[PDB]
């Protein structure tokens, strides 16, 4: 299959037409997405097959063909770009200064950008173009708007 580094759409034909269920990142031969996108199911790339390798429903992350590769982190200071890939529209970089998810276990970056659920898995990047997390698991605020965690895995 297509193993080229970059951002990808995740599609299904299980509904009407072809429907975009989410997005992911190919890096070092590994596909990274959010667990709620695939539910751990295998994926096609042409006539090539991608099998899950690693996942955790709590982190809401899953990796295909290998272990989680993405180990960059928000520095807690600088702005970032959501490389948003919405259903039926072109990849578009959107720059923002993360807010904070304050949890009993620690502080997490959060990005206040609203997009259709099919955008889940779009990468978040630092000034050097490194993926510091994935967009699409978070919360609905006072306003009715959506705030996402910057969800990052652990590299071993």
């Amino acid at each position: 299959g297509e193993t080229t580094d970059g951002v990808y759409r995740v599609m299904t034909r299980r509904l009407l037409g072809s429907t975009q269920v989410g997005v992911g990142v190919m890096q070092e031969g590994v596909f990274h997405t959010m667990w709620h996108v695939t539910k751990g199911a295998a994926l096609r790339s042409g006539e090539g097959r991608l099998d899950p390798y690693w996942g955790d429903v709590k982190q809401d992350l899953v990796s295909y063909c290998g272990p989680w590769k993405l180990d960059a982190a928000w520095d807690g200071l600088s702005e970032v770009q959501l490389l948003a890939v919405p259903p039926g529209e072109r990849a578009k970089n959107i720059q923002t200064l993360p807010g904070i998810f304050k949890t009993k276990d620690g502080d997490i970056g959060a990005v206040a950008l609203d997009y259709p659920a099919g955008t889940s898995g779009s990468p978040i990047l630092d000034k050097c173009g490194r993926v510091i997390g994935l967009y699409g698991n978070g919360v609905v605020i006072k306003n009715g708007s959506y705030v996402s965690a910057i969800t990052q895995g652990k590299r071993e």
Binding site: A41, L50, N93, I94, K102
Partner: protein
């Protein structure tokens, strides 16, 4: 079957659209991986 299609390179793009705020939010994470507002 779900399938993947490439949508672009992973690149910082200088002079991109700058938007969204930066809220500090009190949240809880459940065993099912769903965030919620602690208040």
């Amino acid at each position: 079957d779900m399938y993947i299609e490439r949508a672009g390179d992973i690149t910082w793009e200088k002079d991109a659209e700058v938007t969204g705020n930066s809220p500090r939010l009190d949240v809880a994470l459940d065993e099912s991986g769903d965030f919620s507002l602690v208040e």
